[PDB]
């Protein structure tokens, strides 16, 4: 089930920067994945927090905007990873720009979008064990 992965992930990316907040298999290669995916594209992610500009009055709207565009023409795993890392970006500039309540808010959003927009694709395409298989190393 979906609300769990978001937590351990968000909690992982927040923890691995200095901040503390609020079977077990997929998680771990979803962390090795995010981490490799972010280093994979460090120079591309730098340009991202520089266009983020997060205020709570805009947070919902900022998140919606991106997520809908990212998955507009379809889903694949790479996109799904990119989604998790983006949640991680928001959750961090929240804590940085002193908005840690958002971190709770962003978590619910990520979860509402997994369950109400991405679940079907993951089921119709092998579940998360499918993913682990593919990421492996």
């Amino acid at each position: 089930d979906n609300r769990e992965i978001v937590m351990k992930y968000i909690h992982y990316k927040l923890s691995q920067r200095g901040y503390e907040w609020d079977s077990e298999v997929v998680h771990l290669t979803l962390r090795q994945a995010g981490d490799d995916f972010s280093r994979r594209y460090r120079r591309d992610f730098a340009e991202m927090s520089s266009q983020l500009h997060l205020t709570p009055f805009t947070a919902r709207g900022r998140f919606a905007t991106v997520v809908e565009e990212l998955f507009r023409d379809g889903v694949n795993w790479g996109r799904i990873v990119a989604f998790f890392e983006f949640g991680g970006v928001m959750c961090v500039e929240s804590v940085n720009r002193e908005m840690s309540p958002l971190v709770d808010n962003i978590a619910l959003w990520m979860t509402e979008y997994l369950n109400r927009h991405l679940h079907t694709w993951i089921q119709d395409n092998g579940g998360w064990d499918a993913f682990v298989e593919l990421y492996g190393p």
């Binding site: 594209y41 983020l52 565009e69 996109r79 990873v81």
Partner: peptide, 19 residues
């Protein structure tokens, strides 16, 4: 929509480079 299209691109490149 910047920011999202160019996550998309790298997402899709990743999903390539892992095909």
């Amino acid at each position: 929509i910047x920011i999202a299209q160019x996550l998309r691109x790298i997402g899709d490149x990743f999903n390539x480079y892992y095909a």
